[PDB]
Homo-oligomer: A and B are copies of this chain.
């Protein structure tokens, strides 16, 4: 995702929101009830057109 996110487009508050999940490292390979929401969140963040 850090390959995916530094590409063309996004503004800089988007980048400050984009550096959120570097230290959201380990809760998705085991658990958690709200772990794929951040995965999906930055998927949505890199998915919308710019």
Residues on A close to B: CB < 8 A? 24, 27, 29-31, 34
Contact = CB atoms under 8 A, between A and B. Distances in A.
Majority DSSP secondary structure for residues of A touching B: loop
A34 B34 CA distance: 14
A24 B34 contact: no
Nearest to A31: B34
A27 B31 CA distance: 10
Contacts of A31: 34
A27 B34 CA distance: 14
Nearest to A20: B29
Contacts of A27: 30
Nearest to A30: B24
